[PDB]
Amino acid sequence: SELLVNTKSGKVMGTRVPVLSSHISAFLGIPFAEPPVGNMRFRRPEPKKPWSGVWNASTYPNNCQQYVDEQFPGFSGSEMWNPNREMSEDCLYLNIWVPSPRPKSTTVMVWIYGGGFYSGSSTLDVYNGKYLAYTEEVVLVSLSYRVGAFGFLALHGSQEAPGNVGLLDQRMALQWVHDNIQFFGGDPKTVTIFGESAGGASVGMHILSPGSRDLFRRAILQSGSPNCPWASVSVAEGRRRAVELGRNLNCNLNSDEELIHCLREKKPQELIDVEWNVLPFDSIFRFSFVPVIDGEFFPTSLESMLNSGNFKKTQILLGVNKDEGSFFLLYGAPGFSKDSESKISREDFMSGVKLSVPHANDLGLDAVTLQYTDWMDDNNGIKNRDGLDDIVGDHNVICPLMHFVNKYTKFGNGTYLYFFNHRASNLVWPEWMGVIHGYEIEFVFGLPLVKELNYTAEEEALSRRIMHYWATFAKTGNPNEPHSQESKWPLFTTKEQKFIDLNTEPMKVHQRLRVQMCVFWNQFLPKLLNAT
Amino acid sequence: SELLVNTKSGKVMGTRVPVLSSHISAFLGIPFAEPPVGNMRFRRPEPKKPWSGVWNASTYPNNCQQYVDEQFPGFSGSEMWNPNREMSEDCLYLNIWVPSPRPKSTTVMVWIYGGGFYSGSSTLDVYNGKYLAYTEEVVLVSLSYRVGAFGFLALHGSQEAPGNVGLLDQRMALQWVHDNIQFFGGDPKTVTIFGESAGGASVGMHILSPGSRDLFRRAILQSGSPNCPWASVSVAEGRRRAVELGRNLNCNLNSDEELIHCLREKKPQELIDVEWNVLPFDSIFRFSFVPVIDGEFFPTSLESMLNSGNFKKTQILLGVNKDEGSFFLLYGAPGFSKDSESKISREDFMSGVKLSVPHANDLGLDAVTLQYTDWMDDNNGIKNRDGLDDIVGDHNVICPLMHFVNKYTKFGNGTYLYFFNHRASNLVWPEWMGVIHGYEIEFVFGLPLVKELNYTAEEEALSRRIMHYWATFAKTGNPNEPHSQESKWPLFTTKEQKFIDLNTEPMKVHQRLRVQMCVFWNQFLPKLLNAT
Ligand SMILES: *[C@@H]1O[C@H](CO)[C@@H](O[C@@H]2O[C@H](CO)[C@@H](O[C@@H]3O[C@H](CO)[C@@H](O)[C@H](O[C@H]4O[C@H](CO)[C@@H](O)[C@H](O)[C@@H]4O[C@H]4O[C@H](CO)[C@@H](O)[C@H](O)[C@@H]4O)[C@@H]3O)[C@H](O)[C@H]2NC(C)=O)[C@H](O)[C@H]1NC(C)=O
Ligand SMILES: *[C@@H]1O[C@H](CO)[C@@H](O[C@@H]2O[C@H](CO)[C@@H](O[C@@H]3O[C@H](CO)[C@@H](O)[C@H](O[C@H]4O[C@H](CO)[C@@H](O)[C@H](O)[C@@H]4O[C@H]4O[C@H](CO)[C@@H](O)[C@H](O)[C@@H]4O)[C@@H]3O)[C@H](O)[C@H]2NC(C)=O)[C@H](O)[C@H]1NC(C)=O
Ligand SMILES: *[C@@H]1O[C@H](CO[C@@H]2O[C@@H](C)[C@@H](O)[C@@H](O)[C@@H]2O)[C@@H](O)[C@H](O)[C@H]1NC(C)=O
Ligand SMILES: *[C@@H]1O[C@H](CO[C@@H]2O[C@@H](C)[C@@H](O)[C@@H](O)[C@@H]2O)[C@@H](O)[C@H](O)[C@H]1NC(C)=O
Ligand SMILES: CN(C)c1ccc2nc3ccc(N(C)C)cc3[s+]c2c1
Ligand SMILES: CN(C)c1ccc2nc3ccc(N(C)C)cc3[s+]c2c1
Ligand SMILES: *[C@@H]1O[C@H](CO)[C@@H](O)[C@H](O)[C@H]1NC(C)=O
Ligand SMILES: *[C@@H]1O[C@H](CO)[C@@H](O)[C@H](O)[C@H]1NC(C)=O
């Protein structure tokens, strides 16, 4: 039977699922680790103990414990990112979508979800890998990993809560794929990791981390890169926050053993209820428990690794969206609302700048303000609104990724860069939010192919282009098909720095994605803050 | 006889001069002070001792001792600014152009020449006041004043070389006008001072200085304002340079008396030969001996006076040219030449920035560079060239004048602002130099009316518009004639900040002349350098 597969861990039984009036195999909720429960909370994951008999892999697994957004109850734009399954600490599972008939040795793609390291699920509608598996004839894997304190509490020097264990979850899932995907028709030699937001940052972190480098061939990073300021913290910072969490729960702080014991006795929701209280600044686009720069997962600082060329050298494909900042301004910045144009006053602009750049001294704030203010028309609410959007997106996503790109490309074996700037015809969010952080994903997973979802024909076409790029790149290291009459997506070179717009218009090629602003964020401002 | 005039100092005999095939009276080389010679070098000027008999005022007076530009021997563009008469320490004279027949009580305009406080002459072709006197029916006066060490050596606390004596020359000439111009048909109640470059800065300095305020009604400032960074120095800086001059001439430095005695024994040319050696920085658009902020001529710092409203409250008319920087880059900055396009490399750009902003620390240089570099195309020589031009003009002229304007306008009785951006059809300088510092003057003095000088008809018309503006403003406080079908040159208000282009195209009105760049120069950069 096509739905029965013997892996080194035991037999698994999947399910036949429909897709675009055809069918493929699906194996949902396969365990790649022991459940990290009780005295294993905060610890590194252990490999799943093999099982006899058949694992029922016909339903999605539980989602990991996490914050649940209830800002807009019942609003699809908001709810589409929340857990659709029940939450559990027992959550280290992966899902596999296999074509039918089963292939022998084909290209593998492994999805790492986003959610700012505090949230995320392998099981969301928007990450249903059947469309991609079916259309591009690839084995699509989506892994899971612990988020929040559960995955990233970091008391360095201790083995009970070392930090980064969420990233170790990810790696173990990749180990399992390396070891077992051949039984699903996957080719372990040709595995591509891809992710968005924290998943994109995670992808870049597996490129950097020596322990992870050998378990994949290529990488795709979507609106995330390992050097993003929200994506990691020093071990001293991990320590401060870990203790501050403990302090918020009236824990005994006299030692690491006593603090961890206290944090382990708690019900998960008691940790989630105060998670956000530990941030050291009044900020946006910052999350409480993120990867620590521990000297283990990362031999040295991210920046020195990028300079030295200390990272996996292969092909990468990556890019960003037109309006990466808007989501975070809506939630955290005064002046912004879901149901208004959100024209921003003088006062709310200054507030939003402080919030966007929490380490910036008075002078740093003047510098940002000077960069993003139209002085001809400096009290226009639309320009103020759009300026903050750009500030947040440039600082947190675009300019960090552009630094990564310029650094990686000096040593890598091929880079392809995109700017996704199509606003979906069916987008539930207001127009001022633009091309939103996260909303390229639905195109990458083929949702525009499903006709009851209400996308345009031009949008179906765009999704097909994108899926084919992604797949063809996973397979060959180049998103272009050798013959196509369609114009070539050019390589990104240090010298010419070419990228493409991804939208419904015929492909236009550009150069130097946001150089001026990114010179400010990457070179000038840091140096400004260092001199003060 | 129309050419004989009794003044409180004695009778003077002028000359009938031709002008646009008509004639008017001219009184050239009238003394307003004692010759500041011998033991009076560096001292405040004394009033001219009255004389019996007739003063022959039929020829131009000597020019004051000064540096002579010989960068381009015989080049009219260069030579037009050098002394056309013999140089002498005996140089405190003024010239008067009177209409014919003599008026009874008409509007007076008093020209204060530029030259960076190190040079200048009342007697240059380009400042021939006959065209203006004749066309607008005004009494036109041009004064003179000591430049260089001779006029601005500043050993504060001593009375032999107090500093600012050049400005006292200017004031005494204005005293003389106040006292005696009625005899020439001038109205002392309606005297307008106007000047360019250091003359414009001088005009603004007489607005600020209590001792000068009562001697004029209105003011025009052309490409100069009192707060320009090149226009003044602290008393400690005046002292350092004075001593450094002395040191360059092997003078005894044991005291002020001994140093001054040494400097007084020298032939003037020995002081001029080393004048430039005393600048404390490798710089451009900086001059050795300029007005000191002495607490006497200026009761307090320029900035606090502007804030408090401590200045004469009246009408002002002022503005700047499109390309104020080019002249100085040609002379001082590597890469720039008279006979090339002067496309500027990476290296020469960085050099020019250092030269343009001599007090700027490393970070200050990055900040300027970030502001003026097109990062899309950052190795284009034309953009590099044009960027430096803008840097120099914005920093030294436009942005200082815009600060003055915004500050003055809060307390003043009417401001009118212009941007002169017409390049003369007959300009001898190369095209890359643009609309050059100083080249609006010929329009203000009516040279486009003289047909053998080779200006266009459109240029004659522009000169007539400008002369009429200048005169009509001198007369009424408003450059607009009440009835004219021609569009009104609007008032500059704090709120709307309107100005006009001055060129051959039909008048267009604009707002906020270079806000963005001037926010950088006036607010951000200073604050940056203060925090470091
Ligand atoms: C593709 O396009 C189509 C057509 O353009 C989209 O159709 C939209 O879908 C909505 C429903 O999703 C539909 O409008 C509904 O009509 C029903 C009957 O006429 C209404 O009963 C219903 O209202 C309920 O939901 C609202 C909350 O969202 C409430 O405001 C309202 O009070 C109703 O809520 C009730 O719910 C509880 C529990 O069931 C009940 O006990 C109470 O009575 C309570 O009041 C909807 O208005 C329209 O046809 C379309 N509307 C819009 C705005 O587009 C289709 O959805 C698209 N496909 C996709 C996938 O998006
Ligand atoms: C208005 O427009 C008109 C017409 O368009 C302008 O006319 C220009 O004027 C110049 C002269 O100014 C004239 O060209 C001259 O022609 C003479 C005879 O043909 C030449 O002898 C003369 O050359 C001398 O000057 C040059 C230096 O500038 C030298 O390169 C050259 O070697 C000559 O120099 C000599 O000088 C010494 C001393 O006298 C002598 O002993 C030596 O022999 C020595 O060699 C000129 O070329 C042209 O008609 C026009 N040229 C240009 C470039 O425009 C008119 O000038 C305009 N009016 C105004 C006010 O600008
Ligand atoms: C495999 O499981 C299918 C659905 O499983 C459902 O969820 C799991 C967690 C259990 O609670 C189960 O009882 C639920 O039905 C079944 O429909 C299917 O019959 C199962 N097949 C086999 C061979 O075990
Ligand atoms: C007035 O002066 C005219 C020109 O003066 C000339 O320059 C002065 C400095 C003397 O050097 C003089 O000798 C020169 O001629 C004379 O042409 C004119 O005749 C003089 N007129 C009177 C009435 O004195
Ligand atoms: C409860 N608190 C303090 C916070 C603070 C910041 C936040 N930022 C977000 C950013 C994006 C997002 N998406 C669903 C895209 C959801 C959230 S939820 C959220 C909740
Ligand atoms: C001899 N040295 C050291 C210098 C230094 C700087 C200078 N700057 C100028 C600027 C403008 C100008 N004009 C005639 C407009 C002439 C000069 S001359 C000059 C001479
Ligand atoms: C990638 O590597 C191969 C050989 O290792 C080389 O020949 C090829 O040109 C490289 N391509 C790029 C874009 O670096
Ligand atoms: C100038 O002052 C007069 C009275 O002193 C006043 O009425 C007039 O409106 C003022 N104009 C401006 C532009 O300030």
Tab-separated table of N, CA and C in Angstrom, chain A residues 98-139:
chain	number	residue	atom	x	y	z
A	98	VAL	N	3.556	13.611	-0.142
A	98	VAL	CA	4.249	12.819	-1.149
A	98	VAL	C	3.362	12.676	-2.377
A	99	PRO	N	3.938	12.851	-3.575
A	99	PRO	CA	3.151	12.644	-4.785
A	99	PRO	C	2.688	11.194	-4.982
A	100	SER	N	1.762	11.021	-5.922
A	100	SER	CA	1.235	9.705	-6.257
A	100	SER	C	1.221	9.509	-7.782
A	101	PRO	N	1.823	8.438	-8.294
A	101	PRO	CA	2.533	7.429	-7.497
A	101	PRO	C	3.793	7.960	-6.810
A	102	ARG	N	4.183	7.277	-5.735
A	102	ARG	CA	5.397	7.591	-4.982
A	102	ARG	C	6.615	7.710	-5.897
A	103	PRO	N	7.377	8.801	-5.758
A	103	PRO	CA	8.630	8.897	-6.507
A	103	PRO	C	9.722	8.002	-5.904
A	104	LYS	N	10.847	7.872	-6.594
A	104	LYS	CA	11.966	7.075	-6.101
A	104	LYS	C	12.993	7.932	-5.363
A	105	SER	N	13.363	9.070	-5.951
A	105	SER	CA	14.406	9.947	-5.410
A	105	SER	C	14.255	11.336	-6.032
A	106	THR	N	13.408	12.154	-5.418
A	106	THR	CA	13.071	13.466	-5.966
A	106	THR	C	13.421	14.591	-4.985
A	107	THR	N	13.313	15.822	-5.471
A	107	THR	CA	13.658	17.003	-4.693
A	107	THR	C	12.794	17.153	-3.436
A	108	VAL	N	13.434	17.496	-2.320
A	108	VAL	CA	12.753	17.659	-1.040
A	108	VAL	C	12.794	19.122	-0.606
A	109	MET	N	11.668	19.634	-0.107
A	109	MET	CA	11.606	20.984	0.459
A	109	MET	C	11.046	20.904	1.864
A	110	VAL	N	11.679	21.611	2.791
A	110	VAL	CA	11.337	21.501	4.196
A	110	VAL	C	11.006	22.873	4.746
A	111	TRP	N	9.741	23.040	5.128
A	111	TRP	CA	9.202	24.315	5.562
A	111	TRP	C	9.437	24.526	7.043
A	112	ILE	N	10.016	25.680	7.381
A	112	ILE	CA	10.148	26.128	8.777
A	112	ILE	C	9.299	27.382	9.022
A	113	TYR	N	8.241	27.222	9.805
A	113	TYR	CA	7.277	28.281	9.984
A	113	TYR	C	7.840	29.474	10.744
A	114	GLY	N	7.193	30.624	10.555
A	114	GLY	CA	7.536	31.836	11.288
A	114	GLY	C	6.669	31.995	12.521
A	115	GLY	N	6.585	33.233	12.995
A	115	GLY	CA	5.873	33.568	14.228
A	115	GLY	C	6.740	34.233	15.285
A	116	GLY	N	7.815	34.903	14.866
A	116	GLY	CA	8.659	35.675	15.786
A	116	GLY	C	9.321	34.887	16.901
A	117	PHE	N	9.417	33.575	16.710
A	117	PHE	CA	9.936	32.636	17.722
A	117	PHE	C	9.041	32.483	18.959
A	118	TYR	N	7.907	33.194	19.022
A	118	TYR	CA	6.959	33.081	20.161
A	118	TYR	C	5.679	32.311	19.813
A	119	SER	N	5.526	31.960	18.538
A	119	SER	CA	4.288	31.422	17.996
A	119	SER	C	4.598	30.688	16.716
A	120	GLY	N	3.590	30.029	16.155
A	120	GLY	CA	3.734	29.328	14.876
A	120	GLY	C	3.211	27.905	14.930
A	121	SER	N	2.795	27.397	13.776
A	121	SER	CA	2.288	26.039	13.667
A	121	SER	C	2.657	25.431	12.319
A	122	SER	N	2.964	24.144	12.315
A	122	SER	CA	3.226	23.441	11.067
A	122	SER	C	1.936	23.178	10.288
A	123	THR	N	0.800	23.346	10.961
A	123	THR	CA	-0.482	22.809	10.539
A	123	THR	C	-1.468	23.845	9.987
A	124	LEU	N	-1.021	25.070	9.733
A	124	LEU	CA	-1.932	26.131	9.305
A	124	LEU	C	-2.415	25.872	7.891
A	125	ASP	N	-3.653	26.263	7.594
A	125	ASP	CA	-4.180	26.163	6.230
A	125	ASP	C	-3.145	26.692	5.231
A	126	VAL	N	-2.656	27.897	5.498
A	126	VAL	CA	-1.738	28.570	4.594
A	126	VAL	C	-0.419	27.813	4.328
A	127	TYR	N	-0.040	26.866	5.195
A	127	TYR	CA	1.140	26.014	4.947
A	127	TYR	C	0.765	24.594	4.507
A	128	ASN	N	-0.414	24.405	3.930
A	128	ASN	CA	-0.777	23.090	3.421
A	128	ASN	C	0.071	22.775	2.199
A	129	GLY	N	0.981	21.820	2.349
A	129	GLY	CA	1.961	21.518	1.306
A	129	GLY	C	1.485	20.642	0.159
A	130	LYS	N	0.192	20.342	0.098
A	130	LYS	CA	-0.299	19.448	-0.946
A	130	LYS	C	-0.265	20.085	-2.328
A	131	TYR	N	-0.557	21.379	-2.416
A	131	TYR	CA	-0.608	22.043	-3.724
A	131	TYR	C	0.780	22.052	-4.330
A	132	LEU	N	1.763	22.362	-3.497
A	132	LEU	CA	3.146	22.431	-3.936
A	132	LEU	C	3.639	21.028	-4.293
A	133	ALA	N	3.448	20.081	-3.376
A	133	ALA	CA	3.843	18.694	-3.613
A	133	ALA	C	3.287	18.204	-4.945
A	134	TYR	N	1.992	18.420	-5.147
A	134	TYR	CA	1.326	17.959	-6.359
A	134	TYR	C	1.816	18.721	-7.593
A	135	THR	N	1.848	20.047	-7.532
A	135	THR	CA	2.120	20.824	-8.739
A	135	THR	C	3.562	20.681	-9.209
A	136	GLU	N	4.513	20.809	-8.289
A	136	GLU	CA	5.935	20.762	-8.644
A	136	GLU	C	6.566	19.380	-8.495
A	137	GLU	N	5.782	18.398	-8.043
A	137	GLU	CA	6.239	17.014	-7.910
A	137	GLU	C	7.479	16.924	-7.035
A	138	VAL	N	7.295	17.405	-5.814
A	138	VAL	CA	8.327	17.430	-4.794
A	138	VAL	C	7.776	16.791	-3.534
A	139	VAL	N	8.675	16.296	-2.698
A	139	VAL	CA	8.287	15.835	-1.380
A	139	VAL	C	8.391	17.041	-0.466
